[PDB]
Design a protein around this nucleic acid. Structure first.
Length: 57
DNA sequence: GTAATTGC
DNA sequence: GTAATTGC
């Protein structure tokens, strides 16, 4: 389930974007975080950003 | 270092 | 090959 995520673009605007790809980033034995790959919708620049912990992977 | 991911 | 992304 790839629902939109409220993120801040590297331009500095709040935007609800569907991530292109999501995965967990976690050392062994750690909870870690969830990461998404996003494309800025007007500049076209790719960037990574943390996702909420409840986001489906 | 660490964990995975991938556009650059 | 690795910058950049979180958290410890």
């Amino acid at each position: 389930g790839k629902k939109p995520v409220k993120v801040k673009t590297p331009a500095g605007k709040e935007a609800e974007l569907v991530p292109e790809k999501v995965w967990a980033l976690a050392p062994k034995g750690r909870k870690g975080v969830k990461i998404g790959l996003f494309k800025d919708p007007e500049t076209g620049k790719y960037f990574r950003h943390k996702l909420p912990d409840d986001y489906p992977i």
